[PDB]
Design a protein around this nucleic acid. Structure first.
Lengths: 150, 205, 65, 129, 82, 100, 80, 123
RNA sequence: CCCGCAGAAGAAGCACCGGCUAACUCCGUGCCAGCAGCCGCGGUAAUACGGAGGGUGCAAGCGUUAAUCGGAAUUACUGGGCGUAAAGCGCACGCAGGCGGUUUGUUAAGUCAGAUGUGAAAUCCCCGGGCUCAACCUGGGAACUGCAUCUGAUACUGGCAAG
């Protein structure tokens, strides 16, 4: 039930003594829809086994999100390798706005309205798992209270 | 300032019923609806993200018969208003006088309902109105002129309006052939399948 | 097992609708405690809630209304 | 030249929290103790003491809740290169309010959560997050 | 010659005849001193198309500002009550 | 001096006068030295079955600490006034101030 | 009291008047860095009292020459 | 990128001048074509493209690709300048408008009938 | 503006269809003719040329050109970098400038609070009213993020005196 959706499909190649053989990589993300997201990325010589490996890898290495009713808790900046990620909670009546590679991670997180802007690299493999940072190290009011005292 | 072409091809492109026919005959018998119009209509779409974005935009445009430039100010008025923008456009779209006439059922089609408003035949609050896109405020009593009263188009339209929902926010009365706009409809009242969130993200780019 | 013997519920609240949808068969009747495994204490306050919930029409009496 | 004695001290927290040390060690000034009180009453530190008279010193005992650091992202703002001066109303809320910004107002130094209802701003020193 | 002049601010064929403290040599729709009211000759069934503030105009004739014929019609239409 | 639970529904076409009613009702409890513990307006919620034909009535919830004679009069007031349909008055052991 | 400004006297040797350096600490409108922006104002005085290294308070008055529409009112710290 | 270096000298972004030096940013201009000729395009492609140099009435003498299937343009004729870079032919960044002044439209064209200066046939 | 005459009668074109970007097939052309905003298509099987059919997108307008902003965080104040992509002066001394340990007292410039005046009208936004609706006209508020003055606070920076 955890919102299976793909992101991008890419064709990568080898060079060998015979010549150039091809393979296909698939980008998918999954998540229950209440503060929990898993992402996957698999490779195969054909497209459907790559997505199969992608969703299967997505349904592991599970990372939870500290989440309110439909949106985040604070602005937080996410970086990874070359991509820089900006997220900002919005009003309840507002929908979600993001880039296409910034999109599908967010609906499977349960977030419904965030001002999301991608900075620097627009690489779909790189912007994903950069959005996971921010969600992964997110701070909630109740446990920072335990972190401090009140 | 209307599409005024063949109607079922518009329903054939969207694949569902768009209520541009009266309902006297089944739409399956009238057209081969299951595949898109044209020679290449039976093929798989594999439609893009912007494709289903656009298809949802044309869809809600084509039940209500509203052009794109008129659709944009409908969103712009919904954007400047408070509340959620998605149902606000749906609230603004339901305020059209030809749509109200169809929703109370004086018109067999909303194109037919538009002709009733255009041909000087609809009285609101004791005032005749020609403009089809007239926004109807709450507590407004729609009515018919002396002409088009007990005329054959408005009788046959009423008899096929019983089998529909008979919507809650309007008080239809076929005995004196009039009605009142009690409340603005909400999102829970109108068919529950219109992807109004796909509408917003097309005009947000 | 019974869900209500844990989670520390003092009494089953009729205004909580989401739990009651899981415990009513789609026709509208009350499922027994022999299926869910609810404690006999908590089934009694349970069954009063649907009778209370059906009164304000939050829950249908039958499926043929 | 050691040209911002404050901006050294927040890095002592940054280096102390990252290395998971027990205590940090830095010379003391009155403003140094002043924001040390602000870190105490928000629970970002446990205890601070002022020792010595000829060369006074400020001793801070850091915190480790689930073993990891308690201070996460601490940043000097009003630096000698560019001083930041804001009024009572445009004082930003840190971590959307879950964090705090200490601020040297005219009536004293405190968090942002103490200055806005008091109705006065001042030097935006840093945000503790 | 500081006067009490009547200006046209309305649309085409639908005049909204604004009354305004204006200098004599200035334009009809141009530079002025201050606003005291208006006059809408195509007003609805409801009467709000002609509003004057009686205090400001009284100070201006007390100051020495002459008024024209049409503004004289408006004060002597409202008189004191109606 | 006892805690009660009061829920009543409103005819949808009379939805505009509802803020007056709780304003009128709270003048009866607090006027009779009682107190209000929970106010919430559920809005026009669709019912599972139609009552007096009709669909999507307007629900109002209320938690009241009051003596019983005034709440007897409100029960008659629900009976007397047509705009309120399908009322229910209960009983709560303690005062409650919660969500849902 | 009246409107007056206080600045450092920048000259020493002008005939029965003086130029006074008004110094300000304004904010840069874009980058926000607080910088020293000084202005030099021609200031009148009788029989050339003040001199270099001095700080005076100056006031606005009618034009007596080109750029000299100000006159000092009182001197303080007449020493190096 | 220090702020102290920024107050001393502010940020400067280059103007990034126009692709086509059509004078005074006018959208069209007329001009007299001097020599009409053909040229071979850049390396990946190949054709015999119809191009002409044109002396504009502003004073400039620039080149321009004349479009369409065939033409009847000679020397000293006056044609309208449209714009648009032709990347296959280096040097020419301008187009002429078919069916305007001395320039004729394209014979018997149906698709893109507006953009090639052809009248609608009766239907 | 209202009433009556006759009858569907007097009234639909424009761009696109390889990807970006919504819509695919046939015929002729054969690195010719040509298309093209970028990637690139055409050298005898073109979803990219020209025509036809069909479809798509707008509509009394539709396209092309020109022009500004956005995307462009691609001059980065908010908000960029300088080992190998562009970028550390060949290296020092050093006037101006930028900045500066630490405590006491003074001052109130910067700074912060409050108050006053002003920031014309028109424009934008919000709540209303009228043209059969809308555009448009218009009432009231808000805003006008600024400026000057006056009175307070002295945490820090600044100035002064002393360590």
């Amino acid at each position: 039930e955890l919102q299976e959706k793909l992101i991008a499909v890419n064709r990568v190649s080898k060079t060998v003594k015979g010549g150039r053989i091809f393979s296909f990589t698939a980008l998918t993300v999954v998540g229950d829809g209440n503060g929990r997201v898993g992402f996957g990325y698999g490779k195969a010589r054909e497209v459907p086994a790559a997505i199969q490996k992608a969703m299967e890898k997505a349904r592991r290495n599970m990372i939870n999100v500290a989440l309110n009713n439909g949106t985040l808790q604070h602005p937080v900046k996410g970086v990874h390798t070359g991509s820089r990620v900006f997220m900002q909670p919005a009003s309840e009546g507002t929908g979600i706005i993001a880039g296409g590679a910034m999109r599908a991670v967010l609906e499977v997180a349960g977030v419904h309205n965030v001002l999301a802007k991608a900075y620097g690299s627009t690489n779909p493999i790189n912007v994903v798992r950069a959005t996971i940072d921010g969600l992964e190290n997110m701070n909630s009011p109740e446990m920072v209270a335990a972190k401090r005292g009140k | 300032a209307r599409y005024l072409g063949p109607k079922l091809k518009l329903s054939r492109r969207e694949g569902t019923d768009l209520f541009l026919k009266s309902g006297v005959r089944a739409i399956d018998t009238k057209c081969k609806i299951e595949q898109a119009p044209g020679q290449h209509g039976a093929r798989k779409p594999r439609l893009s993200d912007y494709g289903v974005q656009l298809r949802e935009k044309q869809k809600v445009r084509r039940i209500y018969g509203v052009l794109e430039r008129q659709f944009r100010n409908y969103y712009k008025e919904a954007a400047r208003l408070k509340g959620n923008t998605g149902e606000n456009l749906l609230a603004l779209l339901e305020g059209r006088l030809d749509n109200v006439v169809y929703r109370m059922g004086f018109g067999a089609t909303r194109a037919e309902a538009r002709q009733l408003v255009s041909h000087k035949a609809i009285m609101v609050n004791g005032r005749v109105v020609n403009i089809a896109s007239y926004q109807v405020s709450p507590n407004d009593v729609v009515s018919i002129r002396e002409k088009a009263k007990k005329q054959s188009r408005v009788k046959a339209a009423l008899e096929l309006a019983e089998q529909r929902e008979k919507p809650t926010w309007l008080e239809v009365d076929a005995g004196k052939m009039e009605g009142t706009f009690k409340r603005k409809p909400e999102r829970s009242d109108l068919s529950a399948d219109i992807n109004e969130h796909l509408i917003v993200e097309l005009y947000s780019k | 097992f019974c869900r209500f013997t844990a989670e520390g519920v003092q009494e089953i609240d009729y205004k909580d609708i989401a739990t009651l949808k899981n415990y009513i068969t789609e026709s509208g009747k009350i499922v027994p405690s022999r299926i869910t495994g609810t404690r006999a204490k908590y089934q009694r306050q349970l069954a009063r809630a649907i009778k209370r919930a059906r009164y304000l029409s939050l829950l249908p009496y039958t499926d043929r209304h | 030249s050691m040209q911002d004695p404050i901006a050294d001290m927040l890095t002592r927290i940054r280096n102390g929290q990252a290395a998971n040390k027990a205590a940090v060690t830095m010379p003391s000034s009155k403003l140094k103790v002043a924001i040390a009180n602000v870190l105490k009453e928000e629970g970002f530190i446990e205890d601070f003491k002022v020792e010595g008279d000829t060369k006074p010193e400020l001793e801070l005992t850091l915190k480790y809740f689930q073993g990891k650091a308690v201070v996460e992202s601490i940043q000097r703002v009003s630096r000698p290169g560019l001083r930041i001066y804001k009024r009572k109303d445009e004082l930003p809320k840190v971590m959307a309010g879950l964090g705090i910004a200490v601020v040297s107002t005219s009536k004293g130094v405190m968090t942002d959560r103490a200055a806005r209802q008091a109705g006065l701003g001042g030097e935006i020193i840093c945000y503790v997050a | 010659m500081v006067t009490i002049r009547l200006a046209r601010h309305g649309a085409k064929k639908r005049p909204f005849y604004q009354v305004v403290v204006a200098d004599s040599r200035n334009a009809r729709n141009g530079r002025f001193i201050e606003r005291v009211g208006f006059f809408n000759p195509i007003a609805s069934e409801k009467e709000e198309g002609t509003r004057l503030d009686l205090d400001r105009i009284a100070h201006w004739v007390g100051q020495g500002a002459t008024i024209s014929d049409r503004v004289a019609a408006l004060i002597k239409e409202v008189n004191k009550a109606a | 001096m006892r805690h009660y639970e009061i829920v009543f529904m409103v005819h949808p076409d009379q939805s505009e006068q509802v803020p007056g009613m709780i304003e009128r009702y709270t003048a009866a409890i607090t006027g009779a030295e009682g107190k209000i513990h929970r106010l919430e307006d559920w809005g026009r919620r669709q019912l599972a079955y139609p009552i007096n034909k009709l669909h999507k009535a307007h629900y109002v919830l209320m938690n009241v600490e009051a003596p019983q004679e005034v709440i007897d009069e409100l029960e008659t007031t629900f009976r007397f006034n047509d705009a309120v349909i399908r009322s229910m008055v209960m009983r709560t052991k303690h005062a409650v101030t919660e969500a849902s | 009291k009246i409107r007056t400004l206080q600045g450092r006297v920048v000259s020493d040797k002008m005939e029965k008047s003086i130029v006074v350096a008004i110094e300000r600490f304004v904010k840069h409108p874009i980058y926000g860095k607080f910088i020293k922006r000084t202005t030099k104002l021609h200031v009148h005085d009788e029989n050339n009292e003040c001199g270099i290294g001095d700080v005076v308070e100056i006031r606005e008055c009618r034009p007596l020459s080109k750029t000299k529409s100000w006159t000092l009112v009182r001197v303080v710290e007449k020493a190096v | 990128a220090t702020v102290n270096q920024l107050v001393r000298k502010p940020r400067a972004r280059k103007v990034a001048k126009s692709n086509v030096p059509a004078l005074e940013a006018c959208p069209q201009k007329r001009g007299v074509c001097t020599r009409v000729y053909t040229t071979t395009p850049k390396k990946p492609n190949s054709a015999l493209r119809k191009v002409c140099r044109v002396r504009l009435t502003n004073g400039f003498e620039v080149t321009s690709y004349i479009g369409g299937e065939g033409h009847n343009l000679q020397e000293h004729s006056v044609i309208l300048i449209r714009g648009g870079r032709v990347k296959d032919l280096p040097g020419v960044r301008y187009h002429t408008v078919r069916g305007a002044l001395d320039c004729s439209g394209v014979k018997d064209r149906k698709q893109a009938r507006s953009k090639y200066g052809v009248k609608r046939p009766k239907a």
